[PDB]
Amino acid sequence: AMNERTVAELEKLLRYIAANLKQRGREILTNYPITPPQFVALQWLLEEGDLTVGELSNKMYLACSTTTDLVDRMERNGLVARVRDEHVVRIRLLEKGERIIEEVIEKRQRDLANVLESFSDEEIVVFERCLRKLHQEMTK
Amino acid sequence: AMNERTVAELEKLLRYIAANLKQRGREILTNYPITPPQFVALQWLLEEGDLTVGELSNKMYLACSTTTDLVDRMERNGLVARVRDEHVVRIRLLEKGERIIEEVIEKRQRDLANVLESFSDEEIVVFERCLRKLHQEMTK
Ligand code: NA
Ligand code: NA
Numbered sequence: 001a002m003n004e005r006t007v008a009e010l011e012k013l014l015r016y017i018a019a020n021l022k023q024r025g026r027e028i029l030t031n032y033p034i035t036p037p038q039f040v041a042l043q044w045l046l047e048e049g050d051l052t053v054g055e056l057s058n059k060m061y062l063a064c065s066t067t068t069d070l071v072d073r074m075e076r077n078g079l080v081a082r083v084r085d086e087h088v089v090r091i092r093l094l095e096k097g098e099r100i101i102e103e104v105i106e107k108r109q110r111d112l113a114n115v116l117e118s119f120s121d122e123e124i125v126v127f128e129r130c131l132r133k134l135h136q137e138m139t140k
Numbered sequence: 141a142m143n144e145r146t147v148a149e150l151e152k153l154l155r156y157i158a159a160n161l162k163q164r165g166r167e168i169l170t171n172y173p174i175t176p177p178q179f180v181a182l183q184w185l186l187e188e189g190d191l192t193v194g195e196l197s198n199k200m201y202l203a204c205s206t207t208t209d210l211v212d213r214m215e216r217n218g219l220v221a222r223v224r225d226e227h228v229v230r231i232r233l234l235e236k237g238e239r240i241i242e243e244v245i246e247k248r249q250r251d252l253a254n255v256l257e258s259f260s261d262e263e264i265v266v267f268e269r270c271l272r273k274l275h276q277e278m279t280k
Contacts, residue, residue, distance in 0.1 A: 002253045002256065002257065004249070006264060006268065007249050007252055007253045007256070008249055009268060010252060010256070010264075010267075010268055010271065011245070011248050011249045011252050013268070013271040013272065013275055014161060014252070014271065015161075015183075015248070016275060016279075017158075017271060017274060017275050017278065018157075018158045018161050018162065019180075020275070020278045020279060021154060021155075021158050021278075022158065023201050024278075026201065040159075043155075061163050061166065105151070108151050108155070109144070109147050109148055109151045112147055112150060112151050112154070113142045113147045115274070115277050115278050116142065116147070116150070116277070117142065118277055119273065119277075123270070123273065124146060124150075126266060126270065127150075127270045127273075127274070128146065128149060128150055128153070130263070130266065130267045130270050131150065131153040131154065131157060132153065133259065133263065133267075134157060134255070134267070135153055135156060135157050135160070137255050137256070137258055137259075138157065138160045138161075138164075138255050139156075139160060
């Protein structure tokens with residue numbers, strides 16, 4: 001009962017929006033000593049706390065081998081440490097890693113504030129409402 | 141004059157929406173003999189027509205060397221051909237390439253129609269309006 005002309009428009013929009021956001025993200029990260037998958041990894045640790053490599057890889061949709069090499073690079077560069085339970089080894093965001101990602105996120109926020117400056121108060125509030133519903137339906 | 145709590149929410153939403161869309165895209169492409177950057181390349185050719193490697197690489201935000209290796213793989217697998225002017229060499233979508241991407245896009249559309257089935261007629265129309273404004277402000 002869904003309208004295919006509209007769904008086709010929406011699919012294209014979402015795709016070109018995500019492609020543009022990806023590139024803005026890239027451009028922003030040129031001024032930071034991390035790579036895009038390190039950004040993703042670090043942001044997961046910031047948002048979730050200590051994660052095992054298994055937990056991290058499930059969040060990033062990577063194989064364990066891939067996630068371990070990534071964690072290894074970040075640990076080598078002092079962005080994260082490996083920490084075993086006192087009671088299992090988890091990855092913990094170090095201060096150096098946290099400082100960088102907080103800075104990247106703030107720059108991402110400023111960048112978006114510039115894109116959004118032509119939305120009115122009402123369009124921003126509706127827009128957020130739409131995204132919140134989209135995100136919720138997409139994550140089950 | 142922008143509200144930082146809201147902009148922070150919106151930045152996070154857009155990021156987690158794009159991360160979820162990327163993975164849906166990945167899952168869909170597991171049933172197709174192309175890779176994610178071949179999807180992007182092919183979709184640009186479908187949407188724009190014949191492109192030089194320079195034009196294609198500017199669209200994908202890649203270096204020329206990277207784009208040439210990609211075009212080389214796709215040409216080898218019969219997805220695209222190189223075609224010089226009669227009057228400069230352009231990449232042209234072959235029928236084999238077009239058939240595949242049209243199929244991936246249709247599956248992307250069906251997937252989205254499922255995510256959107258709980259939006260009402262009115263929320264879909266507003267939602268599209270928001271995305272259209274977002275996309276337009278993001279592309280200047
Ligand atoms: Na960088
Ligand atoms: Na594939």
